[PDB]
Amino acid sequence: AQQFQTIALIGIGLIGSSIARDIREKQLAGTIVVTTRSEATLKRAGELGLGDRYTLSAAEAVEGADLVVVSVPVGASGAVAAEIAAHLKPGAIVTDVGSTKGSVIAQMAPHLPKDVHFVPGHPIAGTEHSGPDAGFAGLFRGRWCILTPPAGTDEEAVARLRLFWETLGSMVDEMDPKHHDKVLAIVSHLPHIIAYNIVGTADDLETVTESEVIKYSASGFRDFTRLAASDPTMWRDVCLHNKDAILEMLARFSEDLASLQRAIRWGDGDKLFDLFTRTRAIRRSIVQAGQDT
Amino acid sequence: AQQFQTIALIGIGLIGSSIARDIREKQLAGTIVVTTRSEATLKRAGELGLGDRYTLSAAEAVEGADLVVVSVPVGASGAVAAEIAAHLKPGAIVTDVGSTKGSVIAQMAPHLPKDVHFVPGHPIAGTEHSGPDAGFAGLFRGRWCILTPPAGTDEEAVARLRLFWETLGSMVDEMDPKHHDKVLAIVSHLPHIIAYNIVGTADDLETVTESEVIKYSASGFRDFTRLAASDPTMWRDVCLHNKDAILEMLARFSEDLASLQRAIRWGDGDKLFDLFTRTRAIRRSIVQAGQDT
Ligand SMILES: NC(=O)c1ccc[n+]([C@@H]2O[C@H](COP(=O)([O-])OP(=O)(O)OC[C@H]3O[C@@H](n4cnc5c(N)ncnc54)[C@H](OP(=O)(O)O)[C@@H]3O)[C@@H](O)[C@H]2O)c1
Ligand SMILES: NC(=O)c1ccc[n+]([C@@H]2O[C@H](COP(=O)([O-])OP(=O)(O)OC[C@H]3O[C@@H](n4cnc5c(N)ncnc54)[C@H](OP(=O)(O)O)[C@@H]3O)[C@@H](O)[C@H]2O)c1
Ligand SMILES: N[C@@H](Cc1ccc(O)cc1)C(=O)O
Ligand SMILES: N[C@@H](Cc1ccc(O)cc1)C(=O)O
Ligand SMILES: [Cl-]
Ligand SMILES: [Cl-]
Ligand SMILES: [Mg+2]
Ligand SMILES: [Mg+2]
Ligand SMILES: [Mg+2]
Ligand SMILES: [Mg+2]
Ligand SMILES: [Mg+2]
Ligand SMILES: [Mg+2]
Ligand SMILES: [Mg+2]
Ligand SMILES: [Mg+2]
Question: Which residues are Mg(2+) 2-binding (chains A, B) (predicted)?
Answer without folding.
Answer: 256
